[PDB]
Structure formats: C-alpha cells, structure tokens
C-alpha cells in the first residue's frame, strides 16, 4: 500500500507514480541497466494488458494489489545520485552564509566589559 499523500493522488497520477516507482525499484533490484531493459519492456507490457479496464472495482483491486506488491518490495539500499537528498555527496561543503564581523570589540567601552551586579 502507498502512503496517505499518494492515496490522495488522482487516479491517473496515482497509477503514474505507481509505474514510476516500480521502474525505480526495478532499477534498484537490477544488477545493471542492461538487465533493467527487458524488465522495463515487460513492466510496460503488463500495464498494456490493463489499458481498457472500466469497472472501477476491479481497477481498484489491481491498483491495491500492485501497491501492496511495491510496498513489500521497498529496496533497503536505493540507487541515488550523489548530490541529491539521501546521496553520499549531499551536504558536504556549502557556501558560507553571510556572517557579520565585529572589529576591535575589546577596544570599545573599556573597563566596562564585565557583568552587572
């Protein structure tokens, strides 16, 4: 099953994200992109067997079964590009945010830099 936000997606968008994440997982379980190609073709074909479905009950059944299949198959080690969220190269060395500088603070208001009491 998907998450609650995905549950709120339109039927078209829900199925689109389902197929997209399925391709992502197939890459994640793939040994190589070259292995992923025939899997991609088969995955595209399987949806092609459901193009002309009209009865929303069976449509919902198929969608729910596929969502459960995908949820059971969440990859533990996803393949991420290094400089994106979750990637190893993310958040390594950012540009310094602007920080104001105080010159010669000790020189100001001497003899009176202690603590009130």
């Amino acid at each position: 099953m998907a998450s609650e936000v995905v549950l709120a997606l339109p039927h078209k968008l829900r199925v689109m994200r389902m197929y997209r994440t399925g391709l992502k997982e197939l890459i994640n379980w793939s040994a190589n992109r070259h292995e992923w190609y025939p899997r991609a073709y088969a995955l595209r074909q399987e949806f092609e067997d459901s193009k002309a479905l009209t009865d929303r009950e069976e449509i919902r059944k198929k969608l729910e079964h596929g969502e459960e299949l995908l949820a059971r198959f969440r990859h533990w080690e996803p393949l991420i590009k290094p400089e994106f969220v979750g990637g190893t190269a993310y958040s390594i060395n950012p540009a310094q945010p602007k920080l104001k500088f105080i010159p010669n603070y000790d020189a100001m208001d001497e003899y009176k830099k202690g603590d009130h009491l």
């Binding site: 010669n104 100001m108 208001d109």
Partner: protein, 108 residues
C-alpha cells in the same frame, strides 16, 4: 558604516550617529515565540507532575527498585570484602553490637 573610533583610537560611543553602532548586542538572535514557550515550559515543567497510573508504576519499579538493588549490592560487596580479609561479622548501622574497625595490631 559608522565611525565608533577616531583615526587615532579613542572609541567614540556615537550616541548621535545616524548609523546603527556595532556593539555587544550586535550578534543577538531573534527569538522564536514557540521556542521561548517551549523553553519556559521545560524550565517550569514542575507543574506537570501528577500521581497517575504510569508515573507511580515507573517510580516504584525503577527508582525505588534500583535503589533497593544498589543497596543490597553494596551490602553484598561489603560483606564479601569482610570475608575476603578474614574478618568476622561487622556491625552496620542497626546490626547489634559487634566488631568494628579491626585493630592494626591484630593479624586476621
């Protein structure tokens, strides 16, 4: 852009300077109201105590229970140290008159 100093030192307070003078308060943060409320609540968390089911259960099983465990463990360690030095029973607080402080002049 202000001039809080003269070309030869001499810190100028700049009371009547249009520009905002750099000072000790220059790098103060801007407080977040939710953060301030949270920190007050945590510094004044004492008003949240109550004798509920959970609090009492936790207090007895953990606090007093481990107090008793450490006490009994200390008693065991003390008695075992006594037995490992050749000493008879010793009088702990409320243990009836007995031997205390083995003499340096006696071989045990």
């Amino acid at each position: 852009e202000a001039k809080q100093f003269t070309p030869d030192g001499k810190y100028m307070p700049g009371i009547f300077s249009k520009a905002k003078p750099l000072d000790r308060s220059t790098q103060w943060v801007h407080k977040n109201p939710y953060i301030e409320a949270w920190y007050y609540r945590r510094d004044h968390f004492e008003n949240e105590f109550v004798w509920n089911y959970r609090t009492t259960i936790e207090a007895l099983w953990f606090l007093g229970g481990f107090t008793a465990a450490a006490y009994a463990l200390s008693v065991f360690a003390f008695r075992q140290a006594d037995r490992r030095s050749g000493y008879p029973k010793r009088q702990i607080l409320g243990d009836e008159p007995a031997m205390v402080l083995p003499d340096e002049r006696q071989f045990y």
